[PDB]
From a paper:
CNPase consists of an N-terminal polynucleotide kinase-like domain10, a catalytic phosphodiesterase domain11, and a membrane-anchored C-terminal tail, which contains a cysteine residue that undergoes isoprenylation. The catalytic domain enables the rapid hydrolysis of nucleoside 2′,3′-cyclic phosphates to nucleoside 2′-phosphates. The CNPase catalytic site, lying in a groove between two lobes, has pseudo two-fold symmetry and contains two apposing His-X-Thr-X (X denotes a hydrophobic residue) motifs, characteristic for 2H phosphoesterases 113537.
Pro225 and Pro296 reside in loops α3-β2 and α6-β5, respectively, flanking the edges of the active site – Pro296 near the adenine moiety and Pro225 on the 5′-side of the ligand, next to Pro226.
Residue numbers in the entry: 162 to 205, 213 to 293, 299 to 378
Write the structure that this text describes.
């Protein structure tokens, strides 16, 4: 049997990946300047977040669908054998970014998947949240933080937002509204969604 990739996911083009990478850099630089962030620094001299989130990927940003660990992961073989997965393999997709976010552990961009893009999303064996809510693009990680965290951090954020714990926006950036969720969490609800071009394929390390 042919073993699977490390993980499936949409991989952004050079232009898209550069666009979002700079968009995230500006966000972290602006958030680090904002007065509302400095007050709640103890909950989280100046702390520049670009350094703080030092761990970032090889350089091509991606939105992971299914982590297969070459087949070691559960539901890996089940996932890859799907027709939509093999049909969509190598095909280009347009992902939408609704927001950027930051926690003490991770920083990333929230992806909003279209229904067709939802057919490529796994549903293996996160309560009351529509599938695909986890969809994200990691922008950086803290030193002792695993890659897996970034997805979990987004879910936990959206768990609060549906409750209305974000409340008032503590600031207004030129590209969106800024939100304090406490416990070091920060969300930038983008005014206009960022669209990016990405190819759905498998990554083998
Ligand atoms: N249980 C898991 N263990 C390790 N990596 C996982 C994982 N689930 C998803 N991943 C992804 O494995 C890759 C390792 O770089 C990451 O992209 C991570 O997605 P993420 O970066 O979007 O959070
Ligand atoms: Cl995932
Ligand atoms: Cl999910």
């Amino acid at each position: 049997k042919d073993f699977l990739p490390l993980y499936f996911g949409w991989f952004l083009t050079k232009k898209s990946s550069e666009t979002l990478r700079k968009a995230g850099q500006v966000f972290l630089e602006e958030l680090g300047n904002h007065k509302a962030f400095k007050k709640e620094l103890r909950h989280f001299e100046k702390l520049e977040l670009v350094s703080y989130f030092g761990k970032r990927g090889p350089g091509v940003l991606h939105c992971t669908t299914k982590f297969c660990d070459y087949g070691k992961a559960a539901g890996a073989e089940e996932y890859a054998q799907q027709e939509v997965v093999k049909r969509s393999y190598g095909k280009a997709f347009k992902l939408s970014i609704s927001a950027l976010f930051v926690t003490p552990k991770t920083a990333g961009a929230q992806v909003v998947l279209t229904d067709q893009e939802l057919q490529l999303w796994p549903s293996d064996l996160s309560e009351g949240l529509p599938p695909g809510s986890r969809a994200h693009v990691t922008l950086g990680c803290a030193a002792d933080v695993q890659p897996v965290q970034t997805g979990l951090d987004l879910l936990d954020i959206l768990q609060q937002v549906k409750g209305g714990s974000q409340g008032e926006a503590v600031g207004e950036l030129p590209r969106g509204k800024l939100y304090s969720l406490g416990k070091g969490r920060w969300m930038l609800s983008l005014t206009k969604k960022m669209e990016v071009k990405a190819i759905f394929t498998g990554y083998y390390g």
